[PDB]
Subunit: 221 residues, 2 copies
Amino acid sequence: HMQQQWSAVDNYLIKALIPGDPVLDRVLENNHRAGLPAHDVAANQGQFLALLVRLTQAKRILEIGTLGGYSTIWMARELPADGQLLTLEADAHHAQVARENLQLAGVDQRVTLREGPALQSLESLGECPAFDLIFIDADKPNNPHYLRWALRYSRPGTLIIGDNVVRDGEVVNPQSADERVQGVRQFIEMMGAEPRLTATALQTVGTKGWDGFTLAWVNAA
Amino acid sequence: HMQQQWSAVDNYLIKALIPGDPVLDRVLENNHRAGLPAHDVAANQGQFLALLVRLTQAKRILEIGTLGGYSTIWMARELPADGQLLTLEADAHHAQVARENLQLAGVDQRVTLREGPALQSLESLGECPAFDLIFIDADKPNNPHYLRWALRYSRPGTLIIGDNVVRDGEVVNPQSADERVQGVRQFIEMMGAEPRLTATALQTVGTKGWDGFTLAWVNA
């Protein structure tokens, strides 16, 4: 009932505002063909991320959770010639598919894909310069750990985005047995209690159903 | 059922993320006392607008549709010392409540409120500098005209925000009798046709129910 309406509105809005893109179409076709979980963002969400790159004037982006590289491509296209996007993927099959999509989209020079446990990769960064934009959407149970590393590699004005935080409403459940819910709640609470962050969250609907995301600006200490 | 879930999720997120603000509470209470239509953004939406001010590093903001000044305050608090927010409000009663609220919140010095028909005010500006952020949430029938003016007073990198574009699903109707819906449709289709804009839109839910907004970056 509500879903058909959300989809209809998304269809109208997306067709009106966002131009057709042959390479992005092919990226999504590749993901489905490879049998990946369909966790790709909707086109309007991708364009939103691209606008966040423009707004931050990002030259350095960190993405936690590559999947097939759909979000990666939306962001990476907006980087300057000397820009870099580091993206982390644990799954070998996802990394393989993502590598192919990065090449197809012509962003494989700007993007560095590090395959392995995301935390292992984060622990190995060493004296890395701060990132300008950080996108978090991997294994939810470890969300609070990702936030800690995000803060470590931030500067004043860095934007941190946390996707998929609503969990079909279960985010409000303080006694959930779901580690993904526990991780998201720890993440949100950590964020709210951190003076170095000014944060908000928006619930969204559309073709991908009911969900939401956090957006946090890093304050000067 | 769905609404109660959206409300519970909003209540959780807002309480977790956004510090209590007795002054903003009072602004909202003032709006209700004056009998204003309850069209104020939710607190998470207000904080979003405030982050957009930080992201654009805005020094000049244009808001079309003041109401009680609730969103005006969220934005104006983020302006630097040399910052200015121009807000346009056609309703005399609304303008008076808004002035009171801006003064209460201690931001009136950062805000110029121009009372009168918005289009007339926009016609009056002449050769002023561009705005860094532009927020459109007034009379929907006039949206297409507001966008033309917004473009006129833009620079490359200006962000244009159009709030309340979903019209509870009726935005999809190719032939509705509502002037608000047809205004929003012309606005969206005008936005999509303009190569000087890179636009998107997001549908939102929460305590204010189902709605959505557009976000457009002005190209060089």
